[model samples]
Each structure stands twice: as structure tokens, then as C-alpha cells.
Target: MISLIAALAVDRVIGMENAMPWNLPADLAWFKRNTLNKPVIMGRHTWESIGRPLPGRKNIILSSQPGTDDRVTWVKSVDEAIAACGDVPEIMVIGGGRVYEQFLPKAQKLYLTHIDAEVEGDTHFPDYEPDDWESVFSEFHDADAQNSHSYCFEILERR
Candidate 1:
């Protein structure tokens, strides 16, 4: 499966000035549960923000120029990212705005976290019609001390 997993606000904001707009530890854990052990492809900026290769999963980075990194495979395009994953049962497109925009169309599944608030962000998850997808799973989480916002985790598969 080709999947996009992300947390975005009600306003569809994903990032503001290079960082996620909220503090949601539980959401982070939710992200881990879904992505661990999968081949994850992300833009170089997001990879740089993480600063290290995520353990136990294949890390594929999209960049204009290849870097000398033993921990991650560098690719220049989305097709190359898919090639790096190479026949795996599933491939994950993790992102910054640019990467998400490019991959959203080809993605067959979406694991999304819908946050309750409207936030101001310089970047956003790509625009797609909800009618094109069917929700397979959904769970709501209320705001807690550790995770400051209310959010819903949902799995949607293309129709």
C-alpha cells in the first residue's frame, strides 16, 4: 500500500515556520504505532529536522543533491522513493508540504490525525476530496495535559 500519514488541523494547516503547529505526545505515539517497521519516504528538510535515521525502518530521503549518508537512501524524485521501497507490501510517504503535495495523488491509503483547532501554517496537507475515500477506522482522543489538543485518528482507503 502507498500511504500518507499526517496530523493536520481543522484549517488543514500542517506546519508553520518549519515545525508542526502543536504539542501532541499521544499523537506522536500514535504515529509510531502506525509507521514502525515500514519503509518511510520523506523530504530532505523533514529528514534533516529529525536529524537521524529512524530505527527499524527504511529511511528514504528526497533531495536535489545526494548526500553521503550510510543510514539513509537519497532519491531525487517520488518515483525513485517508491523504487527504493521496492516491492515492499507497503510504502509510507512521510512529509513536509512539498513531498505531501507530490505523493497525495498516488497514495492509496491515508492515516490521518484530524486536529480540532484552526492554526496558522505556512504549509498544508494537500487538497483532496473526502468523497474519494472510505473511512475504515477512526478513534477520537481528547485533550490531555501531555497532549494539548483534541484529535481523531482515522484510516481512509481510496474508493
Candidate 2:
């Protein structure tokens, strides 16, 4: 199965200055919990934003740029990346806007954390047709000392 996971603000803002706008530990935990141990696919910018390959899972970077590290495998396209995953039961496309948009149509599931407040950001998640997907699960969280905002973790599957 292929899935996409992201945490975006109410206005669809994903990042500002190559980093998330808020410090939501719960949201980060949600992401880590869901994506752990699965191969993660991301564009070059997304890889750069994180600054390093995430531990505990294979990191596949889609880019024409030259380079290879023991921690990551570089591919020139999305299909190439998927092929690289081989027989993995699930692959997570975690992204910047363009990478997310490229994989959205083929994704069978979406794991999203919707932040309650609006934010200013340079990157945005692409819009999807509402009818094409149905919400399958939701869990709400309130702001706390470790988290800066309230948000809901949701899973949507293609209808």
C-alpha cells in the first residue's frame, strides 16, 4: 500500500522557511508512529528540509541531483522510487507540495494532521477532490505544554 502523511495548517500551509511553523509534539509523534519502519519517499527539498535521512526506515529521495549516502537511495522519478521499494507492504510518500501532488492520485491512504490555526508558509499541500476520498478515522488533540496548537489526526481512504 502507498500512503501520504502530512501535518498542515488550516490554510494548507505546510512549511515556512523550510521548517514546520508550529511545535506540535503530538502531531510529530503521530507521524512517527504511523510511518515508522516503512520506506519513505520524498522529493529533494523535503529531504533537504529534514537535513538528513530519518533513522529506522529506508529513505528514498527523488532527485536528479548527484549524490548517494548509506542512509539514502536517490531516484530520478516517483515511479523509480516506488520500484525501488520492491515488495514492501507499504510505502509512505512524505513531502513538499510537488512530491505530495505527484503521489496523491496513486495513494490508497492519507494520514493528515490538520492544525486549527492559519499560518504563513512557503509550501502548501495540494487540494484534492472531496468526493474522491472518505474520512475513515479521526482523533482530536488539544494544545498542551509540549504542543503549541490543537489539531486532529485523520485517515482518509480513496472512495
Off by over 4 Å in 1: none
Off by over 4 Å in 2: none
- Which prediction has the highest lDDT against the true structure? 2
- Supply candidate 1's per-residue lDDT for 70: 76
TM-score of 2: 0.96
Candidates in order, TM-scores: namely 0.94, 0.96
Worst 10 residues of 2 by lDDT: 62-71
Q: Give lDDT tens digits, candidate 2, residues 1-159.
A: 899999989778999988876788788888889888999999988888899878888899999877666579999988899999999999999998999999999999999999998888888999988899999999998988888788999999999
Clash tally, candidates in order: 0, 0
Clashing pairs in 2: none
Q: Candidate 2, 107: how far from true, in Å?
A: 0.6
